[PDB]
Amino acid sequence: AVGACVLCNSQTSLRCGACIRRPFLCCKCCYDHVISTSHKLVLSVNPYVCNAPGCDVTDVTQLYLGGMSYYCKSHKPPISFPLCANGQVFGLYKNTCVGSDNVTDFNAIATCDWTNAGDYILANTCTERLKLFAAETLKATEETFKLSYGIATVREVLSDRELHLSWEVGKPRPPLNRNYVFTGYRVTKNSKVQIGEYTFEKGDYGDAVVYRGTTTYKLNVGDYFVLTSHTVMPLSAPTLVPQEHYVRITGLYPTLNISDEFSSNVANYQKVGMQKYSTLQGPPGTGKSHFAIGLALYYPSARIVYTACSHAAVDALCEKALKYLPIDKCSRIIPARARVECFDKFKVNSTLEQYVFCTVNALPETTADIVVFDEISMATNYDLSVVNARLRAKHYVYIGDPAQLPAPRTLLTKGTLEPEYFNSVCRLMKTIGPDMFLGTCRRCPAEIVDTVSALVYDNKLKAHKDKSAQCFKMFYKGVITHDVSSAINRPQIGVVREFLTRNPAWRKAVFISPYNSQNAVASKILGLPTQTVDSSQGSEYDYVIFTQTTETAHSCNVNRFNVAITRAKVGILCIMSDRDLYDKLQFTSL
Amino acid sequence: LTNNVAFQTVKPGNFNKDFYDFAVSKGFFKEGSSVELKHFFFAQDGNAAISDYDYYRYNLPTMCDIRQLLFVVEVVDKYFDCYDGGCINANQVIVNNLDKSAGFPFNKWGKARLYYDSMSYEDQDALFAYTKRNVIPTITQMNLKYAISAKNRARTVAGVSICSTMTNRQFHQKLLKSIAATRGATVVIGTSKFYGGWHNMLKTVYSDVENPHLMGWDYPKCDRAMPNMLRIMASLVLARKHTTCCSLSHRFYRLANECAQVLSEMVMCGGSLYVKPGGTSSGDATTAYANSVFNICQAVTANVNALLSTDGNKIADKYVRNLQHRLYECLYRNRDVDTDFVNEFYAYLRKHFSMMILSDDAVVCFNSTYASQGLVASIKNFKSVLYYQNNVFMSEAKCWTETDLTKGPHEFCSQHTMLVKQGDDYVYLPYPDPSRILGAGCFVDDIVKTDGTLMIERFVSLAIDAYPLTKHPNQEYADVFHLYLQYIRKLHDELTGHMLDMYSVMLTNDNTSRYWEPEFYEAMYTPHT
Amino acid sequence: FSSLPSYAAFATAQEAYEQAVANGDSEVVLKKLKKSLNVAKSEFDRDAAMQRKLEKMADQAMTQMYKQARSEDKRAKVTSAMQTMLFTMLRKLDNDALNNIINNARDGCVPLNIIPLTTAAKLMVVIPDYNTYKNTCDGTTFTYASALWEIQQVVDADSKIVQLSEISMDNSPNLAWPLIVTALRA
Amino acid sequence: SSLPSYAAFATAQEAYEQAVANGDSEVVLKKLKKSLNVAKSEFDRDAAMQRKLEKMADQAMTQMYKQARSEDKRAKVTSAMQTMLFTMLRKLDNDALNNIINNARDGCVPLNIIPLTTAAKLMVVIPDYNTYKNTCDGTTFTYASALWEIQQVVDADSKIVQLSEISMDNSPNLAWPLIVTALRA
Amino acid sequence: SKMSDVKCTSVVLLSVLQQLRVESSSKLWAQCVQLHNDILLAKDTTEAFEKMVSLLSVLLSMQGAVDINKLCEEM
RNA sequence: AUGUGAUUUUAAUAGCUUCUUAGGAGAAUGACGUAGCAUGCUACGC
RNA sequence: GCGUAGCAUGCUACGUCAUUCUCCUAAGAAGCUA
Ligand SMILES: Nc1ncnc2c1ncn2[C@@H]1O[C@H](COP(=O)(O)OP(=O)(O)O)[C@@H](O)[C@H]1O
Ligand SMILES: [Mg+2]
Ligand SMILES: [Zn+2]
Ligand SMILES: [Zn+2]
Ligand SMILES: [Zn+2]
């Protein structure tokens, strides 16, 4: 098989060996990538290992092509030549290749481990193809390291039709997906080398799995299957489609006398109409999530695809559309997994309707007239690429605010990412400024918005509301029970319980806490609907019960407080541990 | 069988734009040309399979005249006397291609290879000997044909099961491969048109007939209108070679199996079993040879009708008048064969009605004086015979007569014939329809045959077929061969370019230099080999 | 070849010849040594070049043996598939009506063409146009094969359900004929 | 021919050529004949294996080319076929095809197959007042290089409107895109 | 050579339509096949072009299948 | 977490021809080796 | 004159290698015909 070089796009057949994503590479580009980094294994239509009966020399700088095989320095035939010669690695299309100088960044992208905070900033300012490759390899590395697997080994080989399974106790196990590969790791001492990529689907009887392999060697007694690679779907579409400015609204048909509430955004709807992709930046609870609906009501004949990374944002959009848009001519898409509860009020799984709602990972290969990507703050370059590849739409609208919490990035544990490096759209907004802006709080009381108008924004956020005085600031130490590596605060929830009887108007509030275990256990203690800070972004809640658990770096970051507290429409009760955060907020002292 | 009927469509052909552009750049396809595309890949909607199986409604129950069929049978058998046949063991049957389908329901689990391998020779002979004293009804699918044709009607072929083909091969294959290995006989099957074979066929047809005139008829709806009586007759004439290997009950049960699996059996046309009223299924183990026996039967019946229906007092040749007298006497006044007169009439036919038969397509070199007098079959006699023994009207606009032998039959096996000069003598060369070759080049039936450089053998074979056009007087006809040669040259040039870019070294021994020289093809129509 | 005793004999003959070259002995002794060396070459090529044909034959038998083992593994799979197909059709038979009609027969033999006509519980009518619909299965029940069938479903060529109120003279053009109506014996 | 065996054969050939030029005694000349013959035998034995390897290399190159090109041709068949379609469709340069294609680019696509028989119903969506003005004149409609008669103009609201309301000044009020139902003339 | 060009454009167009899964709607595939077979069996170029227009109207009618702008800009 | 997909999927009998690869056999030409017969010559013995 | 041994030449038989050709079979791709 042949392909295209990642960093010059010329025809080639040389994959690299030690890159996670198994990329294609050109001739000169492959020579520069293998001569400068620790990656040495190279795969042409056949691997570049030595061809002696017993020998393991993979460094392409050593091997020689003799006859129709590859031999190391010792096993070299008399008439042959080395592969790594004249600045190129021998392969197909040898003399129709044009290299590029971008190997300075490709080496770093393919070499790093995505644990530092320089790796992520490198993967957001390179060329578009390098951006895509970096996002793809980052997703693969995440799936390999985080929640990886327990070391499995086959006790015995009943047959090649079905394998045997034995998970190591202490670590979890990932399920079947042909995209998963469990490298063979017979690690005793005899040829500790990948013996193939395998995937395991268990049967309905006994302890046996009908595996699907990629090699032709029988399983040895000591052979193990370790999840050291995952094959993400190769993405092609660019992170951001090229901009093209228009002079008139094309493909969208404006209305006259749209409504009373959305009359202020008429010029912004025109701005959306006159550009290919537009970006709207607005501090939290300032009106982005209904700006999408007003866009819909300003172009009634235009088919619209609302999409978002998580399930809460799409659900909030569903709420507002049902509140404003004709409920009959809408829809909602759910994946075949059907793992999580969704918004069951429109005709579900009806793609051909004029108003679709979906999660970016479950979009169908369709078209549209405008695709509203909501809350890009939770969007990685992979999600932008997926939405660009699946949805061909005349107009794009990326609404979001970088100041709120970013995507998980579980591997990131050292350093800190600035807002302008979360993804490509955040870089566009923070570098050259948003195309639209609307700062005026419309959801949470003037007191809390005044509080947050200093921590994150330099009092550039105005409020049009009244201070309800229902923003209670409490200082409870909240002894910590670090049970499952996720802080649980029994005294804090108990104190909430004892002060939850004192407030009749707060019985139907929502529980928020920056720790999943605390959120989950809060449901049993007092029965309120619990939602973590991460998944509560987008929804609107009247009364909120927040409990800052520990003095740490996770719950103590300003942005997570911002997104947690700004979700209170009329009032909120916050419990605290950090004094510095207690120093600058403007709440009732209780 | 299923809960929902299945509708099968036929896709259109894949255009080969490179070759069409080359052709139009070589001055082809211009307005008012004599070589214009006429053979395309026609598409069909979902009502193709069942609107084409419905043409069996033309098969009425025909009751053939018996005192005359029982004499046409003797003459037709005399035509099949040079051959030898019998039963063969399962280890002597040779299948041509083992990857071909295995009918229904066996196609769900594999091809014919699976059943020719899973079954040993012992349990193959077991099944065959089981069929010689038992009847095995069988289902046959109707498959739509995806091939280039000049008319939009769907083409359907009866895919017969493996349980039928295995045993029918073991039964018939000795005779069927003795027919395909005899040269100079009436049934020209197994005779090639290359290496001076077409000339040999056309000159054995002219087996000393006094005032020759070439003739060719056409059977409308040949395989869907053939009466059951004549298909049974063909199956019984093919089974006269088992005079020793088989007893009489064995032969009757083999005939019953042939009728139960081929003649009138269940037909699965898109997830549904219908009943086949009759007529030959065109995919059984003996389709070309059974139809050849049919065609000779119709020719001999036409001769008998023409000779008897003649007045009798106008017949001047006193030998032919007595021959007519004895023919009527041997038809309607004798109950036992008269082998002396059967031989006499067979000699008469081969002296005045030389035939050449390929499975439905016949060329005759009939005596002209006798035909004008009425002592031998002419076109009108064939039309009458078809009217009252096939229930189809043979329009005279599709049957040709040639009065000049110096230009061969007008059309035999879809190949026109022309007398060219080779070496020092003259030979008959068959040339095809130029539109057919051009449409075969332009419209391939797959997307990997459109690449071209992968398929140079495709164009080599097409040029082998189209070589004779070079000797045609019409220049636009002769240009097709040179078009194909130039396209092969271009294909090889760009193949070398692509393989020299994909590597740095071209092929070491590239012996394609002979496929764009006319000598390689010119040697394919010379008698030496 | 290289592991044969004849190879050892050839090797020792070559060693002796090279030693005599280093010894520079007479021509007759060298000539005799050459004769011994040459016969070793013939013996080496007598046994070798039979090894190549020996291994060639062994490989041919092994490849054939591999093929026959695979053949006897496909035979079992297809046999199991055929058995399952036959038995699954058995479980589909409507045994009560089939027994009722076969017990009436004299010899126990009945024509196949009626086994459905008198025992099949579900009937599918394929209709090419509206006139045939109105003439064959108008309404919600109809009469075929001297029985009374009730129309349970109606689909079009695209397998899309069609409500019985949509099949009208004026609504005929909008339907994807032919229509397959499925009814059950009553 | 670039092989040590050829080196030995060529040097033996040169030695024999020098000897035959000298025409020395038979013993040395015939001994050189035998040595040349054995060296040639060794050289040809090596050349046969060289040619076998070369032929295997050519077979492998051809098979790899066939496989790569077949998979490439199958991989991109939809895009290639559509681009070929439109290349040919522009090459035709017909008035009707060009008209309908240029209209479909602007958004004036037909909602059903354009009918051929006289007096048949065509439903075409019109997205703009400029597209309406260019094609619709009075109560006539220029489409597919043919003149249709407008029967019924409806809106995205599915409310029947009349040709009077469609005017430059009044155009923004109508809920585009209109749907024109017309008959061939 | 304009008559022998519509007959090839029709083949390419019907291949394109069959690759967009018009085969799955019988009422439309029947009309498409009728127009294709009628273009192929045509003598007067005017009839062939008129049926070509009617058949291309099938491809233009469905909006989510092809991207007419991109395909037409390149040519 | 991106394949709880897709193997959901039709393609006949027979004839002729071209091309490619593998195996065997046969033929012919050439080369090296062993054995046998004949001629010429040489060492010694008779 | 005879023998044993040695060399050269010629011929026969056998063994091995190289080249060319024919065929027998097996597998694969493709084309046309009924
Ligand atoms: N023009 C307006 N006048 C009054 N209230 C508004 C207006 N627009 C929006 N709102 C209210 O403000 C809230 C904004 O919600 P949302 O769009 O989710 O905030 P953001 O997008 O800023 O996070 C809505 O719930 C709505 O009720
Ligand atoms: Mg919002
Ligand atoms: Zn690498
Ligand atoms: Zn080595
Ligand atoms: Zn027999």
mmCIF file of C-alpha atoms in Angstrom, chain A residues 67-292:
data_model
loop_
_atom_site.group_PDB
_atom_site.id
_atom_site.type_symbol
_atom_site.label_atom_id
_atom_site.label_comp_id
_atom_site.label_asym_id
_atom_site.label_seq_id
_atom_site.Cartn_x
_atom_site.Cartn_y
_atom_site.Cartn_z
ATOM 1 C CA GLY A 67 18.702 -9.421 -3.898
ATOM 2 C CA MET A 68 15.102 -9.029 -2.741
ATOM 3 C CA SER A 69 15.646 -9.011 1.034
ATOM 4 C CA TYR A 70 17.148 -6.887 3.808
ATOM 5 C CA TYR A 71 20.229 -7.986 5.749
ATOM 6 C CA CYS A 72 22.149 -6.470 8.643
ATOM 7 C CA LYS A 73 25.826 -5.525 8.469
ATOM 8 C CA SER A 74 26.973 -9.016 9.481
ATOM 9 C CA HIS A 75 24.597 -10.963 7.209
ATOM 10 C CA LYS A 76 25.160 -8.614 4.267
ATOM 11 C CA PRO A 77 25.477 -10.140 0.783
ATOM 12 C CA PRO A 78 28.384 -9.065 -1.436
ATOM 13 C CA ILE A 79 26.307 -7.094 -3.969
ATOM 14 C CA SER A 80 23.911 -4.712 -2.206
ATOM 15 C CA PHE A 81 23.634 -1.127 -0.971
ATOM 16 C CA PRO A 82 22.491 0.523 2.270
ATOM 17 C CA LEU A 83 18.981 1.886 2.627
ATOM 18 C CA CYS A 84 19.788 5.141 4.435
ATOM 19 C CA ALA A 85 21.927 6.683 1.689
ATOM 20 C CA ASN A 86 22.087 9.970 -0.219
ATOM 21 C CA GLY A 87 19.795 11.640 2.308
ATOM 22 C CA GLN A 88 16.885 9.243 1.710
ATOM 23 C CA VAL A 89 15.510 5.927 2.942
ATOM 24 C CA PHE A 90 14.983 3.476 0.105
ATOM 25 C CA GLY A 91 11.338 3.104 -0.853
ATOM 26 C CA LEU A 92 8.792 3.519 -3.601
ATOM 27 C CA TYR A 93 8.619 6.756 -5.591
ATOM 28 C CA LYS A 94 12.272 7.345 -4.788
ATOM 29 C CA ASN A 95 12.954 10.249 -7.167
ATOM 30 C CA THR A 96 9.569 12.013 -7.262
ATOM 31 C CA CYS A 97 9.603 13.253 -3.661
ATOM 32 C CA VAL A 98 9.858 16.827 -2.379
ATOM 33 C CA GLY A 99 10.799 17.179 1.273
ATOM 34 C CA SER A 100 9.986 19.931 3.727
ATOM 35 C CA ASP A 101 11.678 21.654 6.657
ATOM 36 C CA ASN A 102 8.760 21.016 9.049
ATOM 37 C CA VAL A 103 10.550 17.945 10.464
ATOM 38 C CA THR A 104 11.727 20.237 13.271
ATOM 39 C CA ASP A 105 8.171 20.225 14.663
ATOM 40 C CA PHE A 106 7.133 16.757 13.484
ATOM 41 C CA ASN A 107 10.045 15.236 15.404
ATOM 42 C CA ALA A 108 8.859 16.928 18.595
ATOM 43 C CA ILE A 109 5.218 15.970 17.998
ATOM 44 C CA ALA A 110 6.057 12.304 17.405
ATOM 45 C CA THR A 111 8.704 12.159 20.149
ATOM 46 C CA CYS A 112 6.980 13.788 23.119
ATOM 47 C CA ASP A 113 4.693 12.098 25.649
ATOM 48 C CA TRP A 114 1.888 14.694 26.008
ATOM 49 C CA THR A 115 2.455 14.937 29.772
ATOM 50 C CA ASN A 116 4.224 18.317 29.821
ATOM 51 C CA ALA A 117 2.550 21.631 28.933
ATOM 52 C CA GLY A 118 4.885 22.535 26.065
ATOM 53 C CA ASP A 119 3.760 19.593 23.983
ATOM 54 C CA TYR A 120 0.186 20.877 23.847
ATOM 55 C CA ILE A 121 1.212 24.401 22.844
ATOM 56 C CA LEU A 122 3.358 22.913 20.075
ATOM 57 C CA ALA A 123 0.350 20.947 18.794
ATOM 58 C CA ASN A 124 -1.728 24.089 18.211
ATOM 59 C CA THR A 125 0.522 26.477 16.232
ATOM 60 C CA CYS A 126 2.062 24.237 13.544
ATOM 61 C CA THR A 127 0.730 23.617 10.031
ATOM 62 C CA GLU A 128 -2.772 22.223 9.550
ATOM 63 C CA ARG A 129 -1.618 18.705 8.688
ATOM 64 C CA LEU A 130 0.721 18.689 11.680
ATOM 65 C CA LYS A 131 -2.159 19.942 13.837
ATOM 66 C CA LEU A 132 -4.292 17.009 12.697
ATOM 67 C CA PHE A 133 -1.506 14.477 13.214
ATOM 68 C CA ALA A 134 -0.718 15.858 16.671
ATOM 69 C CA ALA A 135 -4.357 15.657 17.751
ATOM 70 C CA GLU A 136 -4.649 12.111 16.402
ATOM 71 C CA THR A 137 -1.511 10.894 18.177
ATOM 72 C CA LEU A 138 -2.566 12.701 21.364
ATOM 73 C CA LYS A 139 -5.878 10.839 21.368
ATOM 74 C CA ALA A 140 -4.058 7.561 20.736
ATOM 75 C CA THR A 141 -1.583 8.213 23.560
ATOM 76 C CA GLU A 142 -4.433 9.090 25.920
ATOM 77 C CA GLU A 143 -6.254 5.858 25.105
ATOM 78 C CA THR A 144 -3.031 3.889 25.627
ATOM 79 C CA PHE A 145 -1.958 5.416 28.945
ATOM 80 C CA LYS A 146 -5.094 6.550 30.769
ATOM 81 C CA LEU A 147 -7.386 3.733 31.954
ATOM 82 C CA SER A 148 -5.264 1.447 29.819
ATOM 83 C CA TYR A 149 -5.836 -2.178 30.831
ATOM 84 C CA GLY A 150 -4.840 -5.046 33.056
ATOM 85 C CA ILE A 151 -2.092 -7.302 31.739
ATOM 86 C CA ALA A 152 -3.861 -10.248 30.103
ATOM 87 C CA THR A 153 -2.176 -13.504 29.112
ATOM 88 C CA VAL A 154 -3.538 -16.655 27.480
ATOM 89 C CA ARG A 155 -3.059 -19.677 29.727
ATOM 90 C CA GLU A 156 -3.485 -22.186 26.888
ATOM 91 C CA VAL A 157 -4.475 -22.196 23.217
ATOM 92 C CA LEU A 158 -7.671 -24.217 22.884
ATOM 93 C CA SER A 159 -7.798 -23.354 19.179
ATOM 94 C CA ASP A 160 -7.137 -20.568 16.702
ATOM 95 C CA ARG A 161 -10.919 -20.130 16.432
ATOM 96 C CA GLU A 162 -11.207 -19.089 20.093
ATOM 97 C CA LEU A 163 -8.515 -17.945 22.517
ATOM 98 C CA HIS A 164 -8.331 -18.148 26.314
ATOM 99 C CA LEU A 165 -8.349 -15.101 28.583
ATOM 100 C CA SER A 166 -6.958 -14.206 32.011
ATOM 101 C CA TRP A 167 -7.125 -10.629 33.295
ATOM 102 C CA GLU A 168 -4.595 -9.550 35.910
ATOM 103 C CA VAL A 169 -6.275 -8.681 39.204
ATOM 104 C CA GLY A 170 -5.685 -5.079 40.302
ATOM 105 C CA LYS A 171 -6.279 -3.200 37.044
ATOM 106 C CA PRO A 172 -9.400 -2.858 34.860
ATOM 107 C CA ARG A 173 -9.961 -4.349 31.401
ATOM 108 C CA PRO A 174 -11.017 -2.530 28.205
ATOM 109 C CA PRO A 175 -13.702 -4.128 26.011
ATOM 110 C CA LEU A 176 -13.615 -5.272 22.388
ATOM 111 C CA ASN A 177 -13.195 -2.824 19.563
ATOM 112 C CA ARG A 178 -11.438 -3.630 16.302
ATOM 113 C CA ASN A 179 -9.822 -0.233 16.930
ATOM 114 C CA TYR A 180 -8.223 -1.662 20.091
ATOM 115 C CA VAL A 181 -4.982 -3.595 19.710
ATOM 116 C CA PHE A 182 -3.322 -5.630 22.464
ATOM 117 C CA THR A 183 0.371 -5.950 21.643
ATOM 118 C CA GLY A 184 1.982 -9.323 22.252
ATOM 119 C CA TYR A 185 4.468 -9.054 25.116
ATOM 120 C CA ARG A 186 6.056 -12.414 25.864
ATOM 121 C CA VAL A 187 8.423 -10.673 28.275
ATOM 122 C CA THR A 188 10.312 -13.634 29.766
ATOM 123 C CA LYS A 189 13.570 -12.789 27.933
ATOM 124 C CA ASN A 190 13.062 -14.574 24.593
ATOM 125 C CA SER A 191 12.445 -11.978 21.873
ATOM 126 C CA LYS A 192 10.522 -9.295 23.754
ATOM 127 C CA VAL A 193 8.984 -8.009 20.518
ATOM 128 C CA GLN A 194 5.489 -7.230 19.246
ATOM 129 C CA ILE A 195 4.171 -10.540 17.918
ATOM 130 C CA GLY A 196 1.069 -8.911 16.405
ATOM 131 C CA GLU A 197 -1.988 -6.802 17.122
ATOM 132 C CA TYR A 198 -5.027 -8.623 18.500
ATOM 133 C CA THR A 199 -8.577 -7.833 19.588
ATOM 134 C CA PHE A 200 -10.674 -9.985 21.915
ATOM 135 C CA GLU A 201 -14.447 -10.561 21.891
ATOM 136 C CA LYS A 202 -15.563 -13.029 24.543
ATOM 137 C CA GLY A 203 -18.115 -15.751 23.878
ATOM 138 C CA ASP A 204 -21.266 -16.637 25.784
ATOM 139 C CA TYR A 205 -19.917 -19.894 27.284
ATOM 140 C CA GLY A 206 -17.123 -20.502 29.774
ATOM 141 C CA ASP A 207 -13.815 -18.624 29.696
ATOM 142 C CA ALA A 208 -12.995 -18.316 25.996
ATOM 143 C CA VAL A 209 -12.654 -15.456 23.510
ATOM 144 C CA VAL A 210 -13.060 -15.509 19.727
ATOM 145 C CA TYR A 211 -10.055 -13.302 19.009
ATOM 146 C CA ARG A 212 -9.051 -11.706 15.710
ATOM 147 C CA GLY A 213 -5.315 -11.563 15.088
ATOM 148 C CA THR A 214 -2.977 -9.796 12.661
ATOM 149 C CA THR A 215 -0.030 -12.232 12.764
ATOM 150 C CA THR A 216 0.603 -15.904 11.982
ATOM 151 C CA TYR A 217 2.289 -17.247 15.123
ATOM 152 C CA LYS A 218 0.684 -19.460 17.749
ATOM 153 C CA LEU A 219 0.394 -18.114 21.281
ATOM 154 C CA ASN A 220 3.232 -19.107 23.601
ATOM 155 C CA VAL A 221 2.710 -19.972 27.268
ATOM 156 C CA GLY A 222 4.236 -16.714 28.514
ATOM 157 C CA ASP A 223 2.752 -14.483 25.818
ATOM 158 C CA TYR A 224 0.659 -11.603 27.169
ATOM 159 C CA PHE A 225 -1.706 -9.098 25.523
ATOM 160 C CA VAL A 226 -1.035 -5.546 26.743
ATOM 161 C CA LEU A 227 -3.038 -2.520 25.600
ATOM 162 C CA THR A 228 -0.154 -0.420 24.238
ATOM 163 C CA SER A 229 -1.915 1.066 21.199
ATOM 164 C CA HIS A 230 -5.341 2.200 20.039
ATOM 165 C CA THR A 231 -6.240 2.950 16.419
ATOM 166 C CA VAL A 232 -8.247 6.164 16.275
ATOM 167 C CA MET A 233 -10.146 6.782 13.060
ATOM 168 C CA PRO A 234 -7.798 8.668 10.698
ATOM 169 C CA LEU A 235 -9.196 12.164 10.238
ATOM 170 C CA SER A 236 -8.753 14.265 7.104
ATOM 171 C CA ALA A 237 -10.796 17.462 7.292
ATOM 172 C CA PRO A 238 -8.892 20.514 8.561
ATOM 173 C CA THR A 239 -9.466 21.858 12.045
ATOM 174 C CA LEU A 240 -10.912 25.046 10.530
ATOM 175 C CA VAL A 241 -12.252 25.311 6.984
ATOM 176 C CA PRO A 242 -10.695 28.258 5.111
ATOM 177 C CA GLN A 243 -12.399 31.586 5.683
ATOM 178 C CA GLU A 244 -14.148 33.327 2.801
ATOM 179 C CA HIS A 245 -15.899 36.668 3.239
ATOM 180 C CA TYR A 246 -19.134 37.371 1.375
ATOM 181 C CA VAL A 247 -20.936 40.612 0.554
ATOM 182 C CA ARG A 248 -24.515 39.332 0.951
ATOM 183 C CA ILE A 249 -26.379 36.557 2.735
ATOM 184 C CA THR A 250 -26.078 33.403 0.617
ATOM 185 C CA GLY A 251 -27.920 30.179 1.365
ATOM 186 C CA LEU A 252 -29.745 31.794 4.303
ATOM 187 C CA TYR A 253 -33.035 33.673 3.996
ATOM 188 C CA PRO A 254 -33.634 36.360 6.640
ATOM 189 C CA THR A 255 -36.966 37.052 8.306
ATOM 190 C CA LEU A 256 -38.545 40.388 9.207
ATOM 191 C CA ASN A 257 -39.924 41.040 12.693
ATOM 192 C CA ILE A 258 -38.290 37.901 14.039
ATOM 193 C CA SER A 259 -39.266 38.451 17.684
ATOM 194 C CA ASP A 260 -38.862 40.870 20.594
ATOM 195 C CA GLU A 261 -36.167 39.110 22.625
ATOM 196 C CA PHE A 262 -33.706 38.495 19.765
ATOM 197 C CA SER A 263 -34.074 41.935 18.158
ATOM 198 C CA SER A 264 -30.710 43.091 19.536
ATOM 199 C CA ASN A 265 -28.691 40.421 17.691
ATOM 200 C CA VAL A 266 -29.968 41.204 14.178
ATOM 201 C CA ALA A 267 -26.610 42.636 13.120
ATOM 202 C CA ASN A 268 -24.828 39.580 14.523
ATOM 203 C CA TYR A 269 -27.125 37.257 12.579
ATOM 204 C CA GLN A 270 -26.229 39.229 9.457
ATOM 205 C CA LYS A 271 -22.554 38.856 10.369
ATOM 206 C CA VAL A 272 -23.003 35.088 10.629
ATOM 207 C CA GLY A 273 -24.719 35.115 7.253
ATOM 208 C CA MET A 274 -21.950 37.076 5.541
ATOM 209 C CA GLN A 275 -19.039 34.788 6.539
ATOM 210 C CA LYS A 276 -18.155 31.125 6.143
ATOM 211 C CA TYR A 277 -17.305 30.387 9.785
ATOM 212 C CA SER A 278 -17.921 32.879 12.582
ATOM 213 C CA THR A 279 -16.944 32.833 16.248
ATOM 214 C CA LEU A 280 -18.977 34.236 19.142
ATOM 215 C CA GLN A 281 -17.222 34.813 22.466
ATOM 216 C CA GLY A 282 -19.303 35.619 25.520
ATOM 217 C CA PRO A 283 -18.636 35.375 29.245
ATOM 218 C CA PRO A 284 -20.774 32.765 30.993
ATOM 219 C CA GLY A 285 -24.501 33.301 31.225
ATOM 220 C CA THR A 286 -24.435 36.230 28.792
ATOM 221 C CA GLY A 287 -26.558 34.672 26.052
ATOM 222 C CA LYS A 288 -24.613 32.484 23.619
ATOM 223 C CA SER A 289 -26.806 29.421 24.080
ATOM 224 C CA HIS A 290 -29.928 31.365 23.120
ATOM 225 C CA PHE A 291 -28.029 33.271 20.444
ATOM 226 C CA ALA A 292 -27.935 29.942 18.639
#
